[PDB]
Structure formats: structure tokens, C-alpha cells
Amino acid sequence: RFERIAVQPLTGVLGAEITGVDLREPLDDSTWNEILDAFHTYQVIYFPGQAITNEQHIAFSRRFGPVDPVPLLKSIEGYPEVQMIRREANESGRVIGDDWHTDSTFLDAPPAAVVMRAIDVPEHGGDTGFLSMYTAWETLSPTMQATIEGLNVVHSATRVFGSLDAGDRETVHPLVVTHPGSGRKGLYVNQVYCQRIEGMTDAESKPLLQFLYEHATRFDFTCRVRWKKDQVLVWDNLCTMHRAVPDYAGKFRYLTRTTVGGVRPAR
Amino acid sequence: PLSQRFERIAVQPLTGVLGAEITGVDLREPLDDSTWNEILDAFHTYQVIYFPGQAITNEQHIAFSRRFGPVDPVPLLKSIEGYPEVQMIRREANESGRVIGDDWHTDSTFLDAPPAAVVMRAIDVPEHGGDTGFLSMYTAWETLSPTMQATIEGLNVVHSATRVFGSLYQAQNRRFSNTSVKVMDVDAGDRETVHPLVVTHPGSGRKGLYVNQVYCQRIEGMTDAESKPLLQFLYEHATRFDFTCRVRWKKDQVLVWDNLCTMHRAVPDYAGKFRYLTRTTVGGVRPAR
Ligand SMILES: C[C@@H](Oc1ccc(Oc2ccc(C#N)cc2F)cc1)C(=O)O
Ligand SMILES: C[C@@H](Oc1ccc(Oc2ccc(C#N)cc2F)cc1)C(=O)O
Ligand SMILES: O=C(O)CCC(=O)C(=O)O
Ligand SMILES: O=C(O)CCC(=O)C(=O)O
Ligand SMILES: [Mn+2]
Ligand SMILES: [Mn+2]
């Protein structure tokens, strides 16, 4: 299909460049449907050359679902929905999201998707990595799949803003989840928020989660997205993970983002 | 700025770590000294460089490679008819065997003198799928703590091809197709050689980590139980995503990678599709501290 937009897949795993559409304008049914189809298929989609306003950013995001900001990020003045991924040139230390993860999985219902918009990015440096948890799951052997399919995992934010109160609040998600849009099964673990496999001792859980982390972040499951000014990107927060790359010390980097609300991860 | 630093070529870095696209040059022609010198500087800085839209012949491919050093074909790969120097990375659309190089490594480090570089040319590649990953072993070394550097900089590592065409390969079931891979002598596969864990690049003068999970067997003098944790950490460290870059291929793209200070990795995400590149290998000298 794709008659209203042009789609250029980035890899054989995930990622696709979308052109032939103006995000500054309202989307008709046929065009929106094609975009949603590509999103469900390619999991991370990006649109070069979309110099959209804050308002148009929010409006595009709302097409995916309710705009429900992530807890920990700072919003731009006048727009609670639009939050900042900002690093000054002078700034030093460690970068936001510089390990493989997906957003806010300590929530009973984590975000469904994130709409990111490049405002000011370096000519090179500051790529974002993404990976497919569909592919991570599908590449596990049938025996391993059957072995871990019924496991549940305890998530909490203790490492991000917890002790290590709301940061210590635990929630339980299935280890393998069915995407409510695509119907497709994907692996659902991440080293940032996952604490233990429910019901297992530390000795039992640690090596299994460790393998899954190593498996999921295999290089051949990833894609690498380069940013340019006015690039608008949407990632699926359920079936992908992402990673920032701190290879731009001394350079200014500024992107905004809206967060699309989701429902309980379900088996 | 690169635009003013380079006068004969144009350089566009791919990441803040390594990789650069090079334009403004015709690899069909002999390169003059000034143009070659700029290319060599860019190669030393960015470690992996590629030239889009270079529709060259097998002879021109060989001629360009020769600027880097003498041609020295890797033992394992088959060559094309009429050109012993030009070897194949070829995968038929219908084969389902082992994909060549689908783990982080650098080429033929089991050799007493592994390759210095490889010049690879896309012949027929998928529209998407089949990217090659690269990483900088300069960066991998430079990001280790001062204490970890002190701890391991004096170590040596045992290399062999045993898992590629030696006893360990023969004892397992995942085999390469005869498309691009020669039948090999098992004893040659098991032959061990010892290289430093940290080497000095002879062109850049920079220190880089020198270990890879394909060919490295153990730290010299250590038991396997002692070696595995250190080596496993180093593999995990070196292959950190932020130390990598990802190259997408297009027909007639010519790429050169530094076989000493980088590692690379095939990506098997193009099942059912034909993929064919050629490559010439540049001979190196014994890795040294
Ligand atoms: C916005 C996002 O919050 C963050 C904020 C910072 C993040 O960076 C991290 C990277 C690695 C690790 C680890 N291990 C922890 C982090 F907090 C990761 C996620 C979210 O989870 O919704
Ligand atoms: C051509 C090249 O030879 C190869 C051929 C295949 C390679 O891929 C692998 C080989 C063994 C193993 C194992 N065990 C894993 C690999 F990814 C890696 C290198 C070379 O080293 O010169
Ligand atoms: O800066 C980036 O590339 C991504 C940072 C991140 O993890 C996020 O915005 O959630
Ligand atoms: O096919 C690739 O992407 C790289 C294969 C490889 O490792 C090699 O040619 O040495
Ligand atoms: Mn994030
Ligand atoms: Mn190789």
C-alpha cells in the first residue's frame, strides 16, 4: 500500500523514514491510517523536514492517543505537554537515557508512544539507538519462548529517582506482552526498571534477566537514527527500547517531546 | 573545520566516535599526492571511511587498495575468477547457512601479521538490510578507568582460528556455505599466536584495545576460568552501543576499515535477499605495544 505517504525502511528489523506528508496540516483519514500502519509495522518512524509548532506537535501526538507527560521531565514554558531533552554545550556529566530502556515502565500503564522533535542538533553526534522487542522475542528459540512465556517481572523506579517513595513503588508486568494495536508478541524487560522475576530468588532471577538484557540489545536487533533539524520521530514505547548516545561533548543539543498515554501491558 | 582543513576531498563524519563519508574524489583514477595524503589523514582520524558512488573496476579496486599497502588476501575467503586479490562476501538469496561475520570481530587476528585494512565494495546489496556495524578500539581503550588500564595494559592474548575453521568449528553444527568460504586445514585453524592486549597503531601512533571474541582464546598465562571474566568484560565494554557506528550500503559504495583499531559486525537482517560485496585485504605488520 502506501499511496498517501512514502515509506523508506531503515533496516530489515525496524525503523522507517516517512515523506510526502505535511505534519503542519491536519491529517485526513486515509493519510493517518497509512501513518498508523507504518508505525505498527516499522515501530519507529521519522519525518524529516517538519518544522512544526508546539501546538502542531501536540495535535499530531493526540492522533496516537491521549497526551500524558512522563513524570520526571521538565516542560517548556506555556506547554505542559511538551517536555525537554536538552543538553547545553557547557554541560558535562552523563546524559539522559544513556542505557537501553523504554520509558517509565514502573507505571501500571507506561506510555504507549513518544513524539520527539529536533529543535537544535549537532551536524554529527547524538544519534538515538532503537531496537525491536518483537524481533528480540521472535529470535528466541521455541524452547526458550515456551520456558519464559508465563513469567512476570517486577518493575520499579528505584534506580532513577528512588532510594538506590513513588520511586520505590513496585508494579508487575508480563515478561512477554501482546501489542494492543498490532496483536504482535514482544519481549518486555529492561535493565533500568526491572528488579526481579516475580516469585524467583535473586540468585534465580539475576542470570535470566541478564541474558534477556544481553539478547535484546544484540546489535542486529537495532537501528540507528540520525537527527536533523525539524525531524519529527515517533517510537512505540511498548515494543521497542531506545538508547541515547553521548558522543557530542561540547555541542548543544535540543529536542522536545510529547508522551502518548498507554494501557496496562497485557499478555 | 573539515571544509577548510581538507582541500582535495570532502569529509562528513558519521558519528562523534568514528566513521566518515568521503566525496569529491574519483577512485577510477590514480590519486595525486595531495589527494591521497588527505584521504590517509581522514582514514587515520575516522578509522572507517566510505566513498559513495564509486563505480570502479576490479583493477581500480586493487589499485586503490595498493595505496594503503601490499595486498595480502585473507586465508578463508574465495576469490573471483581472474582476480586472486579480490575476495567475495557473497550470500545467495536462498541460502540459510551461517552468515559470515555475524559477531563483533576484526579480521584474521590468528595470523602472526593480521591485515592492516580492508577495502570493501558493494556490488549488489538490498535496498534495506545488511548494514555493517563498526566500533573504535581507540575509544574502547580510552574509556577504561586508569586503574583498569594499569591492570591489563601489560597482558598478552592467545589468538587462533579454531572456532572459524579449526577443531572447535568442526566440533559444532553451524557451518558456512561454500559460496564465499574455502575448505581449510584444521591444524591451520588451531594454530595459536600471541598478540598484545593493547597495541600502538603504526600510522596514528595511538593506543587501542586489541581483543575480539571470535579469535581470542585466553589471556596468555591465565587459565580459562581466570581469562573468561576479563575477556568477557572487555567484549561487553568494547561493543557498547555508544562506541559504534552503523554503515548502510548502496551499490558502488567503497569502504575502507582499519583492521587494527576497529572491530566490525555483519547484520543478518536480509533473509531471502541477495547480497554481494567484494573486498581486497591490505597486509599488516605484527601487532605491537
Ligand atoms: C523519560 C525516561 O526517564 C529516564 C531518564 C533517564 C534515563 O537514563 C538512564 C539510563 C540508564 C540507567 C541504568 N542502568 C538509568 C537511567 F535513569 C532513562 C529514562 C522514562 O523512563 O520515561
Ligand atoms: C574473512 C574473516 O573470516 C571470518 C569469517 C566469519 C566470521 O564470523 C564468525 C566466525 C566464527 C564465529 C564463532 N564461534 C562467529 C563469527 F561471527 C568472522 C571472520 C577474517 O577474519 O578474515
Ligand atoms: O536523547 C535521546 O536520544 C533519547 C533520550 C531518552 O531516552 C528519552 O528522551 O526518553
Ligand atoms: O558482511 C558484512 O557486513 C561483513 C562481513 C565480514 O565480517 C568481513 O567481510 O570480514
Ligand atoms: Mn527514554
Ligand atoms: Mn570480518
From Swiss-Prot, chain A:
Which Enzyme Commission number(s) are on file for it? Answer: 1.14.11.44
Which reaction is recorded as catalysed by this protein? (R)-2-(4-chloro-2-methylphenoxy)propanoate + 2-oxoglutarate + O2 = 2-methyl-4-chlorophenol + pyruvate + succinate + CO2; (R)-(2,4-dichlorophenoxy)propanoate + 2-oxoglutarate + O2 = 2,4-dichlorophenol + pyruvate + succinate + CO2
- Write out the pathway annotation from the protein's UniProt entry: Xenobiotic degradation; 2-(2,4-dichlorophenoxy)propanoate degradation
Q: Per the entry, what induces it? A: Repressed during growth on high concentrations of 2,4-dichlorophenoxypropionic acid (2,4-DCPP).
One molecular function GO term is: metal ion binding
Q: Which PANTHER family match?
A: ALPHA-KETOGLUTARATE-DEPENDENT SULFONATE DIOXYGENASE
Description of how the protein assembles with itself and partners: Homotrimer.
Protein name per its UniProtKB record: (R)-phenoxypropionate/alpha-ketoglutarate-dioxygenase
The species this protein belongs to is Delftia acidovorans (Pseudomonas acidovorans)
